[PDB]
């Protein structure tokens, strides 16, 4: 019970694929071209997370703060909530004070 | 829709120029005497004929520091050694055995070419460095 | 028909009479002006450096690699570089030929 | 034919010498030694320092993923706001919520949150001494070929794998360019149907692809290029505002 | 000569650097603590209930009850106002000479705070109320050069050293606005906006700039000679003639109090783009700029 | 519009004269500049008059 019985299908990878041979391309596009572009601007990705990095409660802050007036009802309720939970977690909860 | 009148010209902008910072920290002029009144000396040249070398810094200084750790770990790091850095310890222990008493306690990193000594040197390590070409 | 030449064995082996045929390299770069100690003149200038390697690669049919050029100061040091062997087999060659005892059996599945 | 001689543009410190490679050529099979370039020892010759390189291929590997995992926590699941049976008197556990994370169905306790970033930047300078470094690696190890144009005498890719084939260049080649747009049309049409072998301009030229490929191509262009560009950071001020923005001597 | 190219040739022996056998600097990665096992699960370091087992104890500060120590000291403004002080970067003649021998700064031409930060002398921060640079005397025994040189604030010992060896200096006011333009001028061009006017002290601080003491760069021009002079008697030099010396022009280069920089008038935009200077005619405009 | 003529000069497109005040716009900046920031003469007539009831 719980391993199965026979090999899975063999996986076979490109490593050579046009996505793998040209990866990291243009990541010294600032300073290679004389700054006219960020390495951050490469990046693509939701709206509020180009080029920027935090824990899950400023992730939650900082895409209410900037999609929020677009987001569907539940999921703003639901975001909200976890704006909330988060607040009470990390301010108030854990060892270390 | 009636503007203020106004006049381009072309004479006044070398004041602009005047004002544009360089990104390339300039090479110090030529001094008739050293060291300098701040005490600055170019290194010298020919390079000297030593087994090890240290590069100044982008700014032209001796590339010693002091350094602390756990608010009592006194270290002073000299920088951008090439060629034999363990030669460059040797000499080291040797400057300092006698302003000591005793052998300097020193790390040999090889793969970033840095010296660490525990103690603070720097001024010593400088002079001395300065006296030799570097 | 564009014709690519066959692979060229990485083998070389030192000529009995380099010494000689680089000393008329010299000769043929640098010209007879100091023939005396001719092995220490030195390569500083790239010309004629390209000149004594490019020749002695065409000639020996073996080139100083780029991670060795700057290593070529004078010509001590060419003659050094030609002075060393080099083989280009594999490992199983080199393995079935180092006189293995009777019972040392290698075989090779590539 | 005259030796396609390159020189060092910028100075070289006293104490060091330049390094030097062969001027190849793409234009015969046995065109090699069509030359001898100087190359500025503080790009081609500086430590080998492969913990920096680990560091730079780490950085050009993560700073761009952007994670999409995600869960569902104990207040996102449907539904579960009633107390599934009353505290005492069942003979049961104790439960709030029917999606607790102990339950079938249950939310995720501490489950991806995403979308994620990971994003972070390595101090300009060493992502700059990155690049010398795999530089300075390509030289030492003899993977490193300078060219004096990529110009190939067919666009066929088979010519360009043969070629590389009896100048024992790998399995894989990264030809670098100086510029996109003036890529030889020869060299375009070859390296557009193949996978190992593959083209870029100068701007794009990374660690990650001088690790992945065997062999990096370089024209000679491409040499000042990268001399130029990367000995600046080791001469340059602090800079006062982003170095997009008006200086004195920048850019040239 | 050793080690530095004992590693290239030794680079040539080895295998490929690739993508698959590289690996972080010893010591740099410290391991992940897992609550797994026995010796961290368990309990997993929390200890045994309580309340920091159950991650419940009290906000930082809290003593239990006891009337706290950060809540019993009495309140006294050592802090009050801090934010309306002017804090002034100070330049020493130690590092105002450094900079000189550096080739950093140019004391061929006056010295202003553009000058400074362009050298990377000093770092000015007019969000953190810096209102410039205070000339400071550390190093004064061993200052040798001639400048002209603005700062914002001066030791009487600082311009003493200063005018000992020929040169001058004056003490001018910046406001933040000003003060912003000055120490970054691209920023500002490029914000496509007329050169302000630098606006004058509050009052406060008109009596120092008024001052010839200080010289003031709104002081009496006609009682500089006689505080030149008594410095000089104070500290024993000799008061050098600058009217003699060949840079006199230059050592004379003043701007007016309402401007900012070096030949620029209030109310002219900056053309980086065309490298041009759009100056106004219109009259109500032109009044407003020289007022 | 300021800020792309600044930028990209004549080829912006932006008419210079827009760049200053207009005569309403002066009018507001005279204004608060009277009110906030007064004369030298002012300035020093106020210390004078404070000096002497400190006196
Ligand atoms: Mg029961």
């Known amino acids: 019970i719980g391993i199965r019985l026979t090999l899975p299908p063999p996986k076979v990878v490109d490593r050579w694929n046009e996505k793998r041979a040209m990866f990291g391309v243009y990541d010294n596009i600032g300073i290679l071209g004389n700054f006219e572009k960020h390495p951050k601007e ?24 900037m999609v929020g007036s677009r987001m569907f009802a539940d999921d703003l309720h639901n975001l909200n909530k976890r704006i909330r939970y988060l607040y009470k977690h990390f301010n108030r909860h854990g060892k270390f004070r | 829709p009636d503007y203020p009148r106004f006049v381009e010209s072309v004479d006044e902008y070398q004041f602009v120029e005047r004002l544009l910072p360089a990104t390339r920290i300039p090479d110090p002029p030529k001094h008739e005497h ?101 | 028909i564009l014709v690519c030449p066959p692979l060229r064995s990485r083998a070389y082996t030192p000529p009995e009479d380099l010494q000689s045929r680089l000393e008329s390299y010299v000769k043929e770069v640098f010209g007879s002006s100091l023939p005396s100690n001719w092995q220490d003149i030195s390569l500083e200038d790239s010309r004629l450096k390209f000149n004594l390697l490019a020749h002695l690669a065409d000639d020996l049919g073996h080139v100083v690699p780029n991670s060795r050029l700057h290593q070529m100061c004078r010509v001590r040091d060419v003659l050094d570089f030609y002075n060393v062997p080099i083989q280009d087999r594999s490992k199983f060659d080199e393995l079935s030929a180092s006189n293995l005892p009777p019972n040392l059996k290698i075989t090779w599945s590539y | 034919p005259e030796p396609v001689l390159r020189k060092v543009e910028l100075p ?34 500086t430590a080998p320092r492969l913990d920096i390189l680990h560091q730079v291929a780490m950085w050009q590997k993560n700073f761009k993923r952007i994670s999409y995992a995600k869960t569902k926590t104990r207040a996102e699941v449907r539904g579960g706001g009633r107390k599934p049976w009353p505290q005492k008197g069942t003979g049961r556990a104790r439960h709030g919520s029917i999606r607790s994370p102990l339950w079938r169905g249950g939310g995720v306790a501490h489950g991806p949150r995403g979308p994620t970033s990971y994003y972070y930047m390595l101090p300009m300078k060493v992502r700059a001494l990155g690049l010398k470094v795999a530089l300075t690696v390509k030289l030492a190890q003899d993977d490193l070929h300078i060219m004096d144009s990529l110009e190939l005498p067919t666009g066929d890719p088979q010519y ?69 560009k990367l000995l600046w950071q080791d001469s340059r001020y602090r800079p006062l505002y982003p170095f997009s923005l008006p200086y004195s001597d920048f850019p040239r | 000569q050793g080690g530095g190219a004992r590693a290239l040739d030794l680079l040539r022996g080895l295998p490929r650097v690739s993508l698959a056998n590289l690996k972080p600097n010893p010591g740099s990665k410290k391991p992940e603590r897992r609550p797994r096992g026995r010796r961290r699960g368990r309990k997993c370091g929390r200890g045994h209930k309580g309340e920091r087992q159950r991650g419940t104890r009290p906000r930082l500060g809290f003593e239990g009850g006891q009337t706290p120590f950060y809540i019993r000291i009495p309140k006294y403004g050592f802090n009050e106002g801090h934010s309306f002080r002017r804090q002034y970067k100070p330049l020493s003649l130690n590092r105002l000479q450094y900079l000189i021998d550096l080739g950093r700064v140019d004391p061929s031409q006056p010295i202003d705070l553009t000058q400074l930060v362009n050298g990377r002398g000093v770092t000015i921060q007019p969000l953190k109320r810096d209102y410039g640079v205070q000339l400071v005397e550390e190093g004064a025994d061993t200052f040798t050069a001639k400048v002209n040189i603005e700062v ?25 606005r000003s003060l912003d333009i000055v120490c970054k001028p691209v920023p500002f061009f490029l914000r496509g ?30 009682k500089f000679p006689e505080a030149r002079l008594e410095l000089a008697r104070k500290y024993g030099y000799i008061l050098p003639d600058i009217t003699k010396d060949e840079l006199f022009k230059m050592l004379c280069t003043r701007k007016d109090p309402r401007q900012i920089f070096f030949g620029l008038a209030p109310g002219w935009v900056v053309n980086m783009a065309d490298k041009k200077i759009l100056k106004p005619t219109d009259e109500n405009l032109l009044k407003y700029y020289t007022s | 519009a300021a800020k792309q003529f600044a930028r990209y000069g004549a080829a912006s497109g932006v008419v210079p004269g827009s760049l200053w005040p207009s005569p309403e716009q002066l009018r507001e900046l005279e204004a608060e500049e009277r009110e906030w920031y007064p004369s030298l003469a002012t300035m020093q007539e106020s210390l004078r008059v404070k000096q002497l009831a400190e006196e």
């Open chain 1, 42 to 65: 490469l990046i693509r990705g939701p709206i509020w997370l180009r080029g920027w990095k935090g824990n899950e409660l400023q992730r939650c802050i900082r895409k209410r703060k």
């Open chain 4, 160 to 228: 360009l794998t043969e070629l590389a084939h009896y100048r024992r260049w790998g399995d894989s080649v990264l030809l670098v360019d100086l510029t996109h747009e003036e890529m030889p049309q020869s060299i375009v049409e070859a390296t557009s149907r193949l996978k190992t072998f593959n083209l870029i301009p100068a701007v794009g030229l990374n660690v990650h692809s001088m690790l992945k490929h065997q062999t990096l191509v370089l024209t000679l262009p491409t040499v000042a290029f990268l001399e130029d």
């Open chain 5, 193 to 222: 906006q007329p050169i302000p006017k630098r606006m004058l002290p509050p009052e406060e601080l008109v009596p120092y700039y008024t001052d010839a003491k200080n010289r003031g760069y709104l002081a009496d021009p006609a």
């Open chain 2, 34 to 134: 050293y060291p300098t009144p701040s005490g600055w000396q170019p290194p010298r040249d020919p390079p000297p004929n030593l087994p090890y070398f240290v590069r100044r810094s982008r700014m032209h200084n001796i590339p010693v520091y002091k350094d602390i750790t756990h608010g009592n770990r006194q270290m002073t790091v000299i920088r951008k050694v090439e060629g034999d850095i363990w030669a460059l310890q040797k000499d080291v222990e040797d400057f300092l055995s006698p302003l000591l008493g005793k052998t300097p306690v020193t790390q040999v990193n090889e793969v970033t070419g840095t010296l660490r000594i525990k103690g603070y040197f720097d001024q010593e390590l400088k002079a001395w460095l300065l006296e030799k070409g570097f």
């Open chain 4, 12 to 45: 070289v410190p006293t104490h060091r010498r330049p390094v030097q490679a062969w001027v190849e050529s793409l234009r015969g099979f046995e065109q090699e030694r069509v030359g001898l370039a100087d190359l500025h020892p503080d790009v081609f010759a």
């Open chain 5, 152 to 176: 914002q604030l001066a030791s009487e010992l600082a311009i003493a050293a200063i005018e000992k060896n020929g040169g001058v200096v004056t003490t001018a006011f910046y406001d933040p």
